[PDB]
Design a binder for this molecule. Structure first.
Ligand SMILES: Cc1cc2nc3c(=O)[nH]c(=O)nc-3n(C[C@H](O)[C@H](O)[C@H](O)COP(=O)(O)O)c2cc1C
Length: 168
């Protein structure tokens, strides 16, 4: 209903977590959009947005979000509130951990979206990330490769935070 979650996935991990986010919110509040099938105009239809993306190939956007990314100057995000979550691997890719959500947040915030859902960095071991902005991660950082035991917990906490900063 009122929250549009647009995700991309290469091997399926970011899709399974978008299903949990959806269940945690309610089940009719958020509708999911796999961005291999979305047009950039679909983002226009929501005032509260959640963007989901893994980082692939040392700091790049997942292939479907990369296709869409080059069209994001064509939508105005003023007046919208946006949260971000990504899946990635902090030991394997210690210098590029979660880069994809910092790249997508830079863009959408330049186009006037206001970022909500900032997440602390404690509990992670990484060298560098593009998602680090204003002292925190720009959104929920999950790691299914090395901290899958922590995912359900982190989603429950972040969704409770977002119902506050989204105003549900
Ligand atoms: C060859 C390869 C490159 C990867 N690159 C990055 C990277 O630069 N940063 C990061 O945080 N994780 C990186 N990852 C980890 C993936 O983001 C991670 O396994 C993720 O859950 C995949 O999600 P998906 O199944 O939704 O595509 C890499 C994975 C592979 C196997």
């Amino acid at each position: 209903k009122k929250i549009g979650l647009f995700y991309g996935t290469q091997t399926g991990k970011t899709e399974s977590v978008a299903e949990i986010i959806r269940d945690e919110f309610g089940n009719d509040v958020v509708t999911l959009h796999d961005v291999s099938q979305a047009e950039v105009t679909d983002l226009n239809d929501y005032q509260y947005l959640i963007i989901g993306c893994p980082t692939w190939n040392i700091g790049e956007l997942q292939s479907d979000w990369e296709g869409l990314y080059s069209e994001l100057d064509d939508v105005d995000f003023n007046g919208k509130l946006v949260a971000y979550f990504g899946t990635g691997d902090q030991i394997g890719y210690a210098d590029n951990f979660q880069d994809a959500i910092g790249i997508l947040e830079e863009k959408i915030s330049q186009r006037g979206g206001k970022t909500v859902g900032y997440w602390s960095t404690d509990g992670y071991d990484f060298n560098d990330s593009k998602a680090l902005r204003n002292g925190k991660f720009v959104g929920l950082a999950l790691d299914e490769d090395n901290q899958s035991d922590l995912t359900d917990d982190r989603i429950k906490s972040w969704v409770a935070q977002l119902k506050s900063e989204f105003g549900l």
